[PDB]
Design a protein around this ligand. Structure first.
Ligand SMILES: FC(F)(F)c1ccc(CNc2ccc(Cc3c[nH]c4ncccc34)cn2)cc1
Length: 326
């Protein structure tokens, strides 16, 4: 198994020579056994996602948070047909999670089971599932400002511009947190963002629990399956990944978000023509529902020069003001 064929692995970077950064080997990170949780105290429910070798299942965990209470969690784990490369990747994912620490806008580590049988990674459960398919289900229910509640069927569960601005803010905040821990996601997209109580968005990565070969958003390119339409030119062409290439992806996410889950670059299949156009400076237009200042963020996320892209910290400050001004 070449792991790039099955998932896009996030990376933690460290200072190298001069002003360069190098990837940390995640197997080198420690696993803090404070996270260890008794396997027997889990009760498995429905599958939330599965790929060739991995799955995520909804579970009930006894006494995870309060000694006397059960709580709903999501557990990531491997199928028995998985190879040692996948087993390593999952421990490595747990190590990075242990390293990162906690944030409101990421899917958080709650516990792990690492001895006896297969590695189980216990994370927060998000009741509304992935943001992409939520937007798509809610698309025809988008409520314009100053339109009557009676115009919608279930207006209390509809979607409006304040929701979209909120999601954009929350995702920027989670990515600012990642960048602050020297972490590069490398697969930011609406499919890797979840929605939960209070309409809180949490970044994640289904990873090995995604059927990647059947998701046409990943393209075979080299010895990998890559989310090309989300990727910065320097990542596609030179395999260079930085905090600024995550920013490009974030711009693409914003496009999906304000288009209510439409697919990026419609009428442009990934092929040599696609790559030529991206190099020449083709960029997507404003989505229907995107405010002009949000479209302005998009355009800057897609600067060919990574230095001219905003940082996540700037994006947060920018959207904060947009929300306040409304
Ligand atoms: F935002 C971070 F921190 F970058 C980040 C956090 C976590 C990961 C990967 N771990 C996992 C674990 C389970 C899942 C699926 C998942 C978790 N909670 C759910 N709730 C409902 C449906 C699916 C799910 C996704 N990623 C990858 C990135």
């Amino acid at each position: 198994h070449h792991m790039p064929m099955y998932e896009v692995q996030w990376k933690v970077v460290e200072e190298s020579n001069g002003n360069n950064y190098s990837y940390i080997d995640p197997t080198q990170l420690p696993y803090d056994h404070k996270w260890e949780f008794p396997r027997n105290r889990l009760s498995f429910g429905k599958t939330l996602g599965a790929g060739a070798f991995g799955k995520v299942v909804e579970a009930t965990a006894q006494g995870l948070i309060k000694s006397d209470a059960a709580m709903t969690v999501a557990v990531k784990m491997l199928k028995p047909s998985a190879h040692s490369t996948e087993r390593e990747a999952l421990m490595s994912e747990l190590k990075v999670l242990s390293y990162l620490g906690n944030h409101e806008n990421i899917v958080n580590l709650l516990g792990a089971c690492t001895h006896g049988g297969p590695t189980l990674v216990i994370t927060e459960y998000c009741c509304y599932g992935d943001l992409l398919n939520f937007l798509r289900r809610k698309r025809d229910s988008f409520h314009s400002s100053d339109t009557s509640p009676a115009s919608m069927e279930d207006d209390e569960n509809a979607l409006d511009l304040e929701d979209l601005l909120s999601f954009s803010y929350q995702v920027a905040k989670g990515m600012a947190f990642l960048a602050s821990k020297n972490c590069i996601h490398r697969d930011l997209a609406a499919r890797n963002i979840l929605l939960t109580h209070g309409r809180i968005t949490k970044i994640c990565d289904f990873g090995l629990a995604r059927d990647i070969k059947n998701d046409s958003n990943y393209v075979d390119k080299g010895n990998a399956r890559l989310p090309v339409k989300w990727m910065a030119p320097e990542s596609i062409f030179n395999s260079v990944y930085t905090f600024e290439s995550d920013v490009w992806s974030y711009g693409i996410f914003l496009w999906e978000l304000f288009s209510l889950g439409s697919s990026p670059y419609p009428g442009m299949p990934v092929d040599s023509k696609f790559y030529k156009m991206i190099k020449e400076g083709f960029r997507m237009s404003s989505p229907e529902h995107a405010p002009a200042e949000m479209y302005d963020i998009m355009k800057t996320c897609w600067d060919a020069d990574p230095d001219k892209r905003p940082t996540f910290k700037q994006i947060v400050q920018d959207i904060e003001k947009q929300i306040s001004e409304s």
